[PDB]
């Protein structure tokens, strides 16, 4: 009993230099912070704390294109331990150097930490919506989850959202501005801004609701203590109740508070 | 109907300044690559051809010793996990002296990693062929390719093996005095590569934990290495288990 043909063969093989032709590195090296949650299980009741360990990542810059505060379409090819979905479309946001002049200095990352944080107090009221909403509602609005992150190359900070395609429209805005639903969906999406003044006390309101359906994104958190005592106001003066305010059974917004 | 304190709270202080410290990211992401088989159910039987696509995967160094010079570390995460994640892997370089004889370092490695895996084809034969009599079965490891990019360098990488290590012979016929039958077949087997090879190869430098070996080193006979272990060589109760003819007779009869 012996070594077959194959076998001598493959060995022989192994003695000698077999090829190595590494493909180049398809991407941009990053590292990401999230914003990290108590008991993500009960979101509204939670302590947000950032994150100080980043994880390293990559992510390959697809499109040249700075659509706006602009944002860019990127692929992630690998995540640590997989924070983003290694294998989907992302989109990074930044603001204009300006709009950054217009401060506290080293604007930018802090910026980015805010901008994470007032989309994930619009979640926490999501989850809280969606947490106590009659059954009858069908629709139940959302907020994906916003990353910090940091390129190497380009040395800035960037927020990073899972990019979503899709039918894309405006609800409202941060003037106060809604528009006449048509589908419940649309209904459900502008009460739920009434909502948050309600539950809140007066305290918040959600506005600029975006996105594609259900899946929200950039959104406007406002506090009555411009936007604050304005954009508060319009919006009481303009928004038009229905059928969803009713059966979330809502004061009407245009009255006194003190009655 | 209303909110609480606590998310009034928790709401509001998202509204304010968190801290926020950056610790730089622990431990380095590194690129490997491995030597594949058109056939890993049968190592025997199989084409070995490198990979193009180096997965990217994190590693935390723990210890710096250099007993070719290695060195300890943990998997913490891999893509498409290609380094099983939370374990222990050992990283190996080239010696300063060994490597000044012949870029050459990039090839220094996929040359070892490829004789090892010659190695490892020889005991799938050898477990394969096998009788129940010897019931040990030697094994070797799977090693990788991979690339420091702090370092800018090449290095192997295979797990670490848990337990007493020792050396059952060497690249000159020097070989322990089997103490047990582990030993005997661990010895034996390097006898039975070179029947097997029919002369043609000889699996020296058998080392590593129980069945369990690594770092070999094989022989190719043109030969001199080869003279040694046919003079030094004693069977053992295995070689007989396995028919293994005498190595120190006459070749052309
Ligand atoms: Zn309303
Ligand atoms: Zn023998």
Redesign the interface.
């Given at each position: 009993?012996?070594?077959?043909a194959?076998?001598?063969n493959?060995?022989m093989?192994?003695?000698q230099?077999?090829?190595?032709?590494?493909?180049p590195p398809r991407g941009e090296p990053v590292?990401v912070?999230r914003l990290e949650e108590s008991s993500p299980s009960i979101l509204?009741?939670?302590?947000?704390?950032?994150s100080?360990?980043?994880?390293?990542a990559?992510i390959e810059f697809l499109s040249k294109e700075e659509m706006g505060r602009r944002a860019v379409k990127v692929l992630c090819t690998?995540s640590?331990?997989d924070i983003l979905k290694?294998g989907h479309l992302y989109i990074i946001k930044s603001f204009l150097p300006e709009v950054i002049n217009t401060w506290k200095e080293d604007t930018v990352?802090?910026l980015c930490?805010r901008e994470i944080?007032?989309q994930?107090?619009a979640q926490?009221?999501t989850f809280?919506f969606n947490q106590?909403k009659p059954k009858s509602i069908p629709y139940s609005p959302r907020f994906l989850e916003v990353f910090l992150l940091?390129c190497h190359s380009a040395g800035q900070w960037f927020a990073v959202e899972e990019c979503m395609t899709g039918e894309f429209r405006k609800y409202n805005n941060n003037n106060g501005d809604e528009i006449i639903p048509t589908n419940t969906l649309e209904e459900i999406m502008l009460a739920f801004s009434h909502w948050t003044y309600?539950?809140?006390?007066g305290?918040?309101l959600v506005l600029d609701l975006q996105g594609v359906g259900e899946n929200l994104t950039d959104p406007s958190?406002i506090?009555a203590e411009n936007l604050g005592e304005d954009a508060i106001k319009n919006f009481r003066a303009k928004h038009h109740c229905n059928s969803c305010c009713r059966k979330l059974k809502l004061p009407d917004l245009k009255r006194n508070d003190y009655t």
């Amino acid at each position: 009993y012996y070594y077959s043909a194959v076998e001598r063969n493959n060995l022989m093989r192994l003695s000698q230099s077999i090829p190595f032709v590494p493909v180049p590195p398809r991407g941009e090296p990053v590292t990401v912070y999230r914003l990290e949650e108590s008991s993500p299980s009960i979101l509204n009741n939670s302590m947000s704390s950032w994150s100080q360990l980043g994880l390293c990542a990559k992510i390959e810059f697809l499109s040249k294109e700075e659509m706006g505060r602009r944002a860019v379409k990127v692929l992630c090819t690998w995540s640590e331990h997989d924070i983003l979905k290694s294998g989907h479309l992302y989109i990074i946001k930044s603001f204009l150097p300006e709009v950054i002049n217009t401060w506290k200095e080293d604007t930018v990352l802090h910026l980015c930490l805010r901008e994470i944080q007032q989309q994930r107090a619009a979640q926490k009221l999501t989850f809280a919506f969606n947490q106590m909403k009659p059954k009858s509602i069908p629709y139940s609005p959302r907020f994906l989850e916003v990353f910090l992150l940091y390129c190497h190359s380009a040395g800035q900070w960037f927020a990073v959202e899972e990019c979503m395609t899709g039918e894309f429209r405006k609800y409202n805005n941060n003037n106060g501005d809604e528009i006449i639903p048509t589908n419940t969906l649309e209904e459900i999406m502008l009460a739920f801004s009434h909502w948050t003044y309600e539950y809140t006390r007066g305290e918040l309101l959600v506005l600029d609701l975006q996105g594609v359906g259900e899946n929200l994104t950039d959104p406007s958190v406002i506090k009555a203590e411009n936007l604050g005592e304005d954009a508060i106001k319009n919006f009481r003066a303009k928004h038009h109740c229905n059928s969803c305010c009713r059966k979330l059974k809502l004061p009407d917004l245009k009255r006194n508070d003190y009655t």
